[PDB]
Enzyme design. Structure first.
Site, short mmCIF file in Angstrom:
data_model
loop_
_atom_site.label_atom_id
_atom_site.label_comp_id
_atom_site.label_asym_id
_atom_site.label_seq_id
_atom_site.Cartn_x
_atom_site.Cartn_y
_atom_site.Cartn_z
N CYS A 130 10.19 67.55 1.12
CA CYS A 130 10.89 68.69 0.62
C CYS A 130 12.37 68.53 0.57
CB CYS A 130 10.50 69.97 1.41
SG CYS A 130 11.33 71.39 0.65
N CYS A 133 14.67 71.57 1.36
CA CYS A 133 14.57 71.81 2.79
C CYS A 133 15.42 70.85 3.57
CB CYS A 133 13.14 71.62 3.28
SG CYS A 133 11.88 72.52 2.38
N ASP A 134 15.34 69.56 3.21
CA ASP A 134 15.86 68.50 4.07
C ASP A 134 17.06 67.74 3.56
OD1 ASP A 134 14.08 69.11 5.98
OD2 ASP A 134 12.47 67.86 5.23
#
Ligand SMILES: Cc1cc2nc3c(=O)[nH]c(=O)nc-3n(C[C@H](O)[C@H](O)[C@H](O)COP(=O)(O)OP(=O)(O)OC[C@H]3O[C@@H](n4cnc5c(N)ncnc54)[C@H](O)[C@@H]3O)c2cc1C
Ligand SMILES: Cc1cc2nc3c(=O)[nH]c(=O)nc-3n(C[C@H](O)[C@H](O)[C@H](O)COP(=O)(O)OP(=O)(O)OC[C@H]3O[C@@H](n4cnc5c(N)ncnc54)[C@H](O)[C@@H]3O)c2cc1C
Ligand SMILES: NC(=O)c1ccc[n+]([C@@H]2O[C@H](COP(=O)([O-])OP(=O)(O)OC[C@H]3O[C@@H](n4cnc5c(N)ncnc54)[C@H](OP(=O)(O)O)[C@@H]3O)[C@@H](O)[C@H]2O)c1
Ligand SMILES: NC(=O)c1ccc[n+]([C@@H]2O[C@H](COP(=O)([O-])OP(=O)(O)OC[C@H]3O[C@@H](n4cnc5c(N)ncnc54)[C@H](OP(=O)(O)O)[C@@H]3O)[C@@H](O)[C@H]2O)c1
Lengths: 303, 303
Positions: A130, A133-134
């Site tokens: 992701c 997300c990351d």
């Protein structure tokens, strides 16, 4: 007791629920997480008709917003199983059971794993599925993105905001992604390519990824190269564990419907990415959602 | 010469065109009028996922906006015919011809007529099929709306902004419209109903409508009542005259596709309201549009 329960609040379920509620069906929408589904794991959405670009989590909020006012009952739930009792059905979550005349399954899909060494070991420490997300954890790193489809190529382009460079490793010499996205990646100076290659091992130190071993699929040449992070986009698997028993899935686990979103089982429909199909988009999620919602109304009217 | 020509720039064609252009297919979008199709004849849209409410013409502008930048060639055209030449197809407009590998037909549907006396005669002078277009001409009138579906009931609710009263005449004792819209009409003080009735004659003076004769379908009772305007919403007919010859339509004129939007004829697809189907919505227009666009790409890739 419910006229319809919709399982999952990504765009397919959210559309279904809006439509059922507008038919004044007693509607339960269960979701294990945040409304939006895969859209919350998407940076910029350019191809949803009506918006020229929109951040995935904002589109998720926009789609979720009217539901309460329409009378959809939004509830937390992880569904673990479904039982068909002929003229009603039972849905089992971790703690609850719900009885309903009809069900629309809208639980989507999940990232496929490589099933290589280091992939589990570096889970929280360089391996990711992701980018939104990351990504920011990888500022100034050499990032690797595995895959050749829309997700891999789009997420690589997003990650160029963070990494010193982003390399896309694809197992053939032609991407699968939409050509507009391929061309953007071709032109972007911070994107490199490792063509005709697959990853064989992810390696690191006690605590984080340091390198990736890979192999050329035409020659067998094996190379090891340093990277700081690896983002994997090698396809999808169905999220349908709660119906394994029921006789409504194909060999890979996808839910089989006809063109009106009906499964084998009367009064159980499926929509969106969880279905057996080829084209997984928000547009067709929404379409499926609406169709199932009209089919559920009709089914319940008849019952 | 074109990879794909999309005929009509309502939401189905606009979605198809966005998707084809993103696949870098040489895309022509022909439209005889204003982009938006039926959405421009819609006051408020509440059920398009992503917007809680939006005026039809604004949603039309939002959907049309990215197309130019994506490289869609937007052109004026009224299409009068299509010729299948095996490995290419020809499209004939009033003045032009276009050759293309594939076609996506997205020409929608048009208001059904009552085919009663006075209906043609009072065309510009009390008879209307478009409330957002004409409503404000009827300020303080007693307005009549014929039909029992989503359009009739929604457009009656819109027209209450203008008329002293709005009466919905429906040929049965139960509406077809979505229950949320029925309930809104039930509650609205300025909406009256003439149940179990059909209009038989529209009457007027030299210059405008004055009254409507109607009949009860259970008893034959005939009534004549004064009205200032009549808006007719009795269903849809296909807009597919340019393919009558081709063997791709049903007895009513709708274009028959399979689930991937394919007609009989290879490389000719159809999407949205023009198709044979039951559920005509913007959601399923958009879905169809996207599916056909992916099918056209594949078709052309193979060619
Ligand atoms: C990185 C990325 C970028 C993308 N970009 C685009 C794009 O730009 N345009 C586009 O058209 N498409 C894009 N997609 C595809 C799009 O996001 C999906 O097609 C769409 O979200 C699928 O919607 P759905 O409602 O079927 O499934 P999902 O969005 O997957 O939602 C499923 C929901 O079900 C819930 N769920 C699962 N199991 C359970 C359970 N057992 N009980 C309760 N709830 C459960 C999940 O929490 C989730 O919220 C993208 C996908 C990815 C990964
Ligand atoms: C009053 C009303 C309110 C509505 N409200 C809603 C709602 O709130 N929500 C919802 O989901 N749906 C609603 N709908 C339904 C929705 O508008 C349609 O389902 C959708 O617009 C169909 O899109 P389409 O692209 O298939 O056809 P259309 O929008 O009909 O577009 C067809 C296009 O093809 C063009 N065309 C036709 N023939 C030719 C030719 N020969 N050459 C060139 N161009 C041509 C037309 O000019 C048009 O622009 C409503 C409909 C009406 C009438
Ligand atoms: N903007 C958008 O519309 C958008 C954005 C994201 C996703 N989506 C949709 O979501 C769905 C999922 O897309 P996806 O990109 O996640 O999955 P996908 O289409 O299955 O693509 C996976 C890619 O990874 C490749 N691959 C698989 N195993 C590999 C390996 N071991 N090493 C290197 N490369 C490998 C595949 O190869 P092959 O090509 O050889 O099979 C493929 O190119 C698709 O239908 C997609 O179009 C849409
Ligand atoms: N918000 C939305 O989603 C929205 C808004 C508008 C339209 N749409 C869609 O667009 C499509 C077209 O809808 P529509 O409402 O235009 O058409 P429709 O669904 O065909 O409804 C036509 C209505 O008029 C009735 N009727 C037919 N002849 C009549 C007569 N002679 N006298 C009196 N009443 C008569 C029909 O009766 P019977 O019911 O007896 O057949 C029906 O109730 C539909 O699929 C609809 O759902 C959607």
């Amino acid at each position: 007791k419910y006229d319809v329960v919709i399982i999952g609040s990504g765009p397919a379920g959210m559309t279904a629920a809006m439509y059922t509620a507008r038919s004044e069906m007693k509607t339960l929408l269960l979701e294990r997480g945040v409304p939006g589904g895969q859209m919350n794991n998407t940076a910029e959405i350019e191809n949803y008709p009506g918006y020229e670009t929109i951040m995935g989590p904002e589109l998720s909020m926009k789609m979720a917003e009217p539901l309460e006012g329409l009378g959809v009952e939004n509830a937390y739930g992880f569904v673990t199983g479904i039982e068909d009792h002929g003229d009603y059905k039972k849905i089992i979550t971790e703690d609850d059971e719900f009885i309903t005349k009809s069900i629309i399954i809208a639980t989507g899909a999940n990232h496929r794993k490589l099933e290589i060494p280091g992939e589990e070991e570096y889970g929280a420490r360089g391996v990711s599925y992701c980018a939104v997300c990351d990504g920011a954890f990888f500022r100034n790193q050499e990032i690797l993105v595995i895959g050749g489809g829309d997700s891999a190529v789009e997420e690589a382009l997003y990650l160029t905001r963070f990494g010193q460079s982003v390399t896309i490793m694809h197992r053939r010499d032609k991407l699968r992604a939409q050509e507009i996205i391929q061309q953007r990646a071709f032109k972007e100076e911070k994107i490199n390519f490792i063509w005709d290659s697959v990853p064989m091992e992810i390696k690191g130190d006690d605590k984080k990824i340091q390198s990736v071993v890979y192999k050329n699929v035409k020659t067998g040449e094996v190379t090891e190269k340093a990277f700081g992070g690896i983002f994997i986009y090698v396809g999808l698997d169905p999220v349908a564990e709660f119906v394994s028993d029921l006789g409504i899935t194909d060999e890979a686990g996808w839910i089989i419907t006809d063109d009106h979103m009906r499964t084998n089982i009367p009064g159980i429909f499926a929509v969106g990415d969880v279905r057996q199909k080829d084209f997984r988009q928000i547009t067709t999620a929404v379409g499926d959602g609406a169709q199932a919602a009209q089919e559920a109304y009709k089914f319940v009217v008849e019952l």
